[PDB]
Design a protein around this ligand. Structure first.
Ligand code: MG
Lengths: 152, 149, 140, 101, 132
């Protein structure tokens, strides 16, 4: 019923992960962000905090981890199109030239979602950066499956 | 403004001064871990784009020969050595140290040393067969003044 | 592709070991085929490939072999009437020189993988090594 | 089904000679020499006779693999002259041509 | 008279293909070899095994593509790979060929324990070299 209680509960599980000397993995953070996509409005500050903690711990964000932050900051059913967020621009600079490998079950989803955000913003320069990232190394393998390859 | 890596963090966890302390294979791969890996492979599973990528996959699966061609690929004869195939007189200790049986077995082990189609185990089996054969024929040999074992 | 080009193509990992490399004084590649023209194209492909990697190559044509045998033409009787068949083998020898073991593996793989159908190779590597350490010094 | 009952009998001769190859080698070695007493050699002469007749490898005949023809076979292809000609005259054998010279 | 592999003259109404028109003595002169392996080269082994595998592969493709083969198949062995190149008439629907390719390749790779690929060139109808 209460998100604040719900969020404090999920955090309690994380606190018991340190009491028992159990270190988190990529899937742990990916799971938390995927859950946050329900509360688009209130999950923005929590979601960014997780990614900063991911780097400090030493877990490297994968394509799936950004796929969740994009959904949370660029809702498809977004009425407030007047002033969209600029985070997509920063992510592409961060991932510029990097090569990615399968490390989660939502890696394929990232590219299809990034192109959609480009069409919504009517920015063709960003679409070239996204496509250029797909061409570096063997990133082409994470475009998506039959349903998502034709959408991208 | 919305800096991806500048700002407050959860801080529930601490910097990993110790990293990956427990080994990845804490136990033999469970069904849960074995199945998640198969799903990770499907995430990056795309179809072949040319004959090179198809041959690469065949090579990883052993379907296609490795190059340059090695006519003895995967053909190791029990990790033996040349001296094992060539020097076979150690196995003739049970036999008489001299006499006709020694003269005969010398010819047998000489041929076995020149045999490239038998392994050391198969060569020893030929030697053992004669040891048991002459033992059964102890009585006929004794009449001929030959003492075996 | 006109506008869409890969950016940073992935290249295989080649790690230099600490083991010393083999030294091949000679490496004879005797290819065999029923067709001369196929050998000419493979000779051109192999000589061009050797020259592009820095390998020294020479080529000659060993004498061809023709094997002929006779058979009986009729299914039954009629001994005197026969039919003869032949198989022709043609050779092209690519004599390479002064190759390290890394250069001979990559070259042989590249040309062995592109060996046309109906063509058989017979590589004859000639390695050169020092004397055994025991033999170097006479010991009684 | 094999081509005929003659090809089947030969197949069994080939599979029983493989089973008894080592045995007939070891025993026959005791006889093909002049170093062992003739009493032992005479006795090995009887053990080899006691093995089943189909173990003897001289009862194998090379027959066309496709028609089971006893004579006229070419050992490199294991085909009779008649069957080999059908494949050769059609371009189905790699490198076989007619001999004109 | 020689009757071997000769499509005899009719009255000008029999359509023979290029392969059918040429008698055996034109092998290596006007028409090449349908199978290309290294097993009949000098000092090479396994001629008997390559020849038997070809006979089967020809009967298998006829039955698997009944009435859909415009000409004899061409077999190409490179390393352990086998390649079957067949001219096929455009009788069957397109998707049926995708099924028969997947089936015939998988079945023949598990029967001879080698990688087998099928290459199909579709023709509108049989190509006639001459009317004999
Ligand atoms: Mg005989």
């Amino acid at each position: 019923e209460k998100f604040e209680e719900k969020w404090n509960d999920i955090l309690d599980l994380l606190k018991h992960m340190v009491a028992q000397k159990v270190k988190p993995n990529l899937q742990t953070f990916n799971t938390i962000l995927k859950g946050l996509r329900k509360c688009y409005s209130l999950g923005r500050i929590p979601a960014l905090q997780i990614l900063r903690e991911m780097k400090h711990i030493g877990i490297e964000p994968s394509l799936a981890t950004y796929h969740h932050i994009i959904h949370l900051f660029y809702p498809r059913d977004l009425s407030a199109i007047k002033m969209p967020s600029l985070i997509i621009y920063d992510i592409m600079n961060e991932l510029e030239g990097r090569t990615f490998s399968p490390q989660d079950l939502d890696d394929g989803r990232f590219f299809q979602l990034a192109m959609s955000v480009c069409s919504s913003l009517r920015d063709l320069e960003l679409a070239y950066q996204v496509h250029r990232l797909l061409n570096t190394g063997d990133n082409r393998k994470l475009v998506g499956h039959d349903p998502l390859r034709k959408v991208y | 403004r919305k800096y991806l890596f500048k700002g407050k963090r959860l801080s529930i966890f601490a910097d990993k001064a110790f990293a990956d302390e427990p080994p990845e294979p804490e136990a033999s791969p469970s069904l849960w871990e074995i199945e998640f890996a198969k799903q990770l492979a499907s995430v990056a599973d795309q179809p072949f784009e040319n004959g090179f990528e198809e041959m690469i996959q065949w090579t990883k699966e052993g379907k296609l020969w490795e190059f340059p061609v090695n006519n003895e690929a995967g053909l190791d004869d029990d990790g033996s050595e040349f001296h094992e195939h060539i020097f076979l007189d150690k196995y003739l200790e049970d036999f008489p140290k001299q006499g006709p049986i020694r003269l005969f077995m010398e010819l047998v082990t000489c041929g076995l040393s020149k045999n490239p189609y038998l392994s050391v185990k198969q060569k020893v089996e030929h030697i053992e067969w004669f040891r048991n054969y002459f033992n059964e024929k102890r009585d006929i040999l004794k009449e001929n003044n030959i003492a075996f074992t | 592709l006109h506008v869409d080009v890969p950016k940073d193509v992935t290249r295989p990992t080649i790690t230099t070991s600490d083991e010393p490399d083999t030294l091949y004084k000679r490496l004879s590649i005797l290819v065999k085929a029923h067709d001369r023209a196929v050998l000419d194209s493979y000779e051109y492909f192999a000589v061009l490939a050797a020259k592009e990697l820095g390998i020294s190559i020479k080529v000659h044509e060993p004498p061809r072999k023709i094997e002929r045998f006779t058979l009986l033409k009729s299914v039954h009787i009629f001994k005197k009437h026969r039919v003869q068949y032949e198989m022709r083998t043609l050779y092209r020898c690519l004599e390479l020189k002064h190759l390290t073991g890394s250069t001979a593996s990559v070259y042989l793989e590249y040309i062995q993988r592109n060996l046309p159908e109906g063509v058989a190779m017979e590589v004859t590597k000639t390695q050169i090594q020092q004397l055994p350490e025991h033999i170097k010094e006479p010991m009684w | 089904y094999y081509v005929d009952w003659r090809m089947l009998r030969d197949l069994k001769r080939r599979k029983m000679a493989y089973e008894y190859a080592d045995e007939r080698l070891r025993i026959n070695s005791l006889r093909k020499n002049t170093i062992l007493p003739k009493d032992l050699q005479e006795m090995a002469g009887d053990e080899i006779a006691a093995l089943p007749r189909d173990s003897c490898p001289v009862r194998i005949r090379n027959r066309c693999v496709m028609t089971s023809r006893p004579r006229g076979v070419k050992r490199r292809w294991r085909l009779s002259r008649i069957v080999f000609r059908h494949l050769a005259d059609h371009g189905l054998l790699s490198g076989v041509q007619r001999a004109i010279w | 008279k020689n009757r071997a592999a000769r499509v005899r003259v009719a009255k000008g109404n029999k359509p023979v293909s290029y392969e059918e028109a040429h008698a055996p003595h034109y092998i290596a002169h006007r028409k090449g070899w349908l199978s290309l392996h290294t097993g009949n080269l000098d000092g090479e082994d396994h001629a008997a095994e390559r020849t038997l595998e070809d006979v089967f592969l020809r009967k298998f493709m006829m039955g698997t593509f009944p009435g859909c083969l415009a000409d004899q198949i061409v077999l190409k062995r490179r390393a352990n790979q086998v390649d079957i190149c067949a001219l096929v008439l455009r009788q069957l629907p397109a998707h049926k060929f995708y099924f028969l390719v997947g089936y015939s390749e998988t079945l023949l790779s598990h029967f001879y324990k080698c990688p087998v690929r099928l290459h199909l060139q579709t023709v509108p109808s049989k190509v006639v070299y001459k009317y004999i």
